[PDB]
Amino acid sequence: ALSLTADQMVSALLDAEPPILYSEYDPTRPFSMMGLLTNLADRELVHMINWAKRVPGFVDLTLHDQVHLLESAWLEILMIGLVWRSMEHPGKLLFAPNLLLDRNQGKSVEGMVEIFDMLLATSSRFRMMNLQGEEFVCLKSIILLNSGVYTFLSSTLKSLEEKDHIHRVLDKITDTLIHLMAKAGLTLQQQHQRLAQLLLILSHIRHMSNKGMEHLYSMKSKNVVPSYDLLLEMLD
Amino acid sequence: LALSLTADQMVSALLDAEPPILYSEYDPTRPFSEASMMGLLTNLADRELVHMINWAKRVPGFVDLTLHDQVHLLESAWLEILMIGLVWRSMEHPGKLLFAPNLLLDRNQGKSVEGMVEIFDMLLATSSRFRMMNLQGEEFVCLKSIILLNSGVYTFLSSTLKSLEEKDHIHRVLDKITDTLIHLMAKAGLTLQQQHQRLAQLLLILSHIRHMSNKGMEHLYSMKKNVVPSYDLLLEMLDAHRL
Ligand SMILES: CCN(CC)CCOc1ccc(/C(=C(/Cl)c2ccccc2)c2ccccc2)cc1
Ligand SMILES: CCN(CC)CCOc1ccc(/C(=C(/Cl)c2ccccc2)c2ccccc2)cc1
């Protein structure tokens, strides 16, 4: 599937997009913050596995490596999705269409408003850059392929082939991002510049995931961080 | 006035601003298993940080920022910058980390402190990736300046007119480093496709470097020691003389 043209790559990613889910609270009852966020994330994760298997090249990998990639990336992917759908809602986070929250509403869990603030800034940055949908799906696929690629625990022949593949798929997505920017009329300089600005935002998204992963682990709750086996059970 | 700088001028500036490679301070005539490995890394890092401040002030456009914003950027970036330095000078030493010329450690030596072999393994993998990519010195200095300028830019948390202007400037300087990276690549004869593919490959490694810094910072905080540089320390070091 690295024979795909740039336009075929975009279409495939656009097709693979997960749906927008709703929060599960009774809207007729008075308005747990973590509870709502957790159920939302749970349900999104199932759809994320579905999406991942539709990212060109992903199912070419071993099941083990697919799990490793998702294990490393799942919160980054949830967060970029959140930031994307929040883009046109300054100062708020659209967790769900029935759950649009501001930073003050985040101040009811310790350490949450700090995370909310980081997400809001990323959304602002997306707005400034006028991030497009076709660019977003590319960046999201890059996260899936990239975040875990430096932490493969082996140098077996197969693992070398797997890493080679991952980097070839990533190069294809780079080629596609550039194409999108060419299609929109950006100059060559502008193209490289925007590529860089987009990819640099991924470091901040990594950062936000790390801070959030710290929170989930501090809870000392058994099922809160997805196990290898859960991911394995879903992917197979 | 560093936005007028050319691509070759930008590289030259950055190469000239490079900090020195420091040596570990242990008595080499003394038994090795005495020394605390966290002790050695901490002292090395302390000394490196001073040189980092002076390097930062020589990154084109960095001293055009407010002192508060300079501090914020370094507060965010300092461990990423130490780590990319480490990974760079380890590039030519497979399976080892060259903390200093007289302190070249493997992953087994990192098993000294619990939780540290995991970080060593990530650093080693980064170094291996640099090796695979045949990372050049001029590309290295560009990436390191990008880390300095980019890592804290999303967390200023001021929307004053001044802060807007500061962020605009940071992104203009970043754009210029991007132009510089591309120029280097075109100079080396890479096709346009190869140029944008390698730019992306290099920038994606920065996310893993962020990751490594976060895991490292988790450790330093876990110690419950003054081991994380305070704002006031960074301010004290940056807010200097000219006497
Ligand atoms: C295995 C079961 N797990 C993961 C699915 C339960 C899910 O735990 C959570 C997963 C994600 C989030 C979350 C955010 Cl922003 C968050 C993370 C950490 C600390 C504070 C906030 C978020 C929720 C929805 C969309 C985007 C982000 C919260 C709990
Ligand atoms: C007192 C304030 N700071 C000074 C920065 C002290 C900060 O202590 C340390 C700073 C850096 C390192 C360090 C590594 Cl790789 C590390 C970090 C966390 C856990 C395990 C290892 C490193 C050292 C030198 C070069 C590259 C990396 C260790 C202690």
Residue numbers in the entry:
A (entry chain D): 307 to 337, 341 to 545
B (entry chain B): 306 to 529, 531 to 549
Quoted passage from the original study:
The pro-oncogenic cellular activities of estrogen receptor alpha (ERα) drive breast cancer pathogenesis. Ligand-dependent transcriptional activities depend on the association of coactivator proteins with ERα to form functional complexes. SERMs and SERDs elicit a structural rearrangement of the ERα LBD to sterically preclude binding of coactivators in the activating function-2 cleft. Activating somatic mutations near ERα helix 12, Y537S and D538G, enable hormone therapy resistance in metastatic ER +breast cancers.
High-resolution x-ray crystal structures of WT and Y537S ERα ligand binding domain in complex with the methylated Laso derivatives or representative SERMs and SERDs show that molecules that favor a highly buried helix 12 antagonist conformation achieve the greatest transcriptional suppression activities in breast cancer cells harboring WT/Y537S ESR1. Overall, these structures present canonical ERα LBD homodimers with 2–4 monomers in the asymmetric unit. As with other ERα LBD structures, these show significant crystal contact influences at H12 of one monomer but not the other, namely a contact at or near 538 that affects the positioning of 537. For analysis purposes, we have named the monomer free of H12 free of crystal contacts ‘Chain A’.
